[PDB]
């Protein structure tokens, strides 16, 4: 029930944080 919502929040967190690393490394190449 609240099973799929908590698994989905957890994968979205992992995806957001994957994406945040690549975006952070990108914004430094542009800045440099």
């Amino acid at each position: 029930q609240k099973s799929a919502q908590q698994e989905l929040k957890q994968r979205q967190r992992a995806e957001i944080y994957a994406l945040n690393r690549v975006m952070t490394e990108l914004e430094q190449q542009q800045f440099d």
């Binding site: 957890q10 994406l19 952070t24």
Partner: protein, 250 residues
């Protein structure tokens, strides 16, 4: 550009718009997105512990503790701000959004950090908190940014989050409010930004259940049209008024 108004588990229209955005800005684009969304498995990122005030911390230790929590949540480069802050809501609701930030543990941007900074200093009555907002010019367009001014035991400082390390926290070492603002100004100089407009609020109440909103615009200065001596004149006048605790919201 985009803000998440759909809660947590982010809805699909907001989810796709995040990815669609990032595929444009990134050179690798559709490949870099494919690699994340389709990965069979991904490491669960560690969840930083919400900082707790200990009897062995000084006020500087606490503000560094709070600031380090914010640095660990990480600045949000995804293009989609994850918590909605309605600037003009009563503190009570902003306070709840702050709790939600510590539960969901995602990246944050400048305004979210200020709300969260208020939340984590609400239990220390000797720390006064007031917002500081800048409007800036860089190579064509205007930029807005906000930090949390801190006043404590005769010294000024700040908490916040920014893309740049020099536009966030400032140690509690500035003897006047003018000195702190001028340090932000010179920090902005290093990135070719011209400071157009500086906005300073009132002290924020310490009661987490307050019905009144945040005053963001008590003092407003078009510093690009002003010489140094007149900016300092007005900030010191206003900072004296803050500490004498006499002011009524604008």
């Amino acid at each position: 550009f985009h803000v998440n108004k759909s809660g947590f588990p982010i809805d699909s229209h907001t989810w796709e718009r995040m990815w669609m955005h990032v595929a444009k800005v990134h050179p690798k684009g559709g490949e870099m997105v494919g690699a994340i969304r389709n990965a069979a498995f991904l490491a669960k990122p560690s969840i930083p512990q919400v900082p707790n005030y200990r009897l062995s911390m000084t006020i500087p230790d606490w503000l560094q503790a709070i600031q380090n929590y914010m640095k660990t949540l990480q600045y949000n480069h995804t293009g989609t701000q994850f918590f909605e802050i309605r600037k003009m809501r009563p503190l009570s609701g902003l306070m709840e959004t702050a709790k939600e930030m510590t539960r969901e543990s995602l990246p944050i941007k400048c305004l979210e950090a200020v709300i969260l900074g208020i939340y984590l200093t609400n239990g220390q009555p000797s720390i006064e908190r007031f917002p500081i907002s800048f409007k800036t010019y860089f190579s064509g367009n205007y930029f807005h940014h906000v930090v949390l001014g801190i006043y404590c035991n005769g010294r000024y400082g700040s908490l916040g989050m920014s893309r740049r390390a020099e536009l966030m926290d400032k140690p509690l070492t500035f003897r006047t409010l003018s000195d702190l603002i001028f340090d932000f100004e010179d920090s902005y100089k290093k990135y070719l930004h011209t400071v157009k407009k500086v906005k300073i609020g009132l002290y924020v109440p310490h009661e987490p259940h307050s019905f009144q909103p945040i005053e963001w615009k008590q003092l407003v200065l078009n510093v690009s049209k002003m010489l140094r001596a007149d900016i300092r004149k007005e900030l010191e006048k206003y900072a004296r008024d803050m500490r004498m605790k006499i002011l009524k919201p604008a």
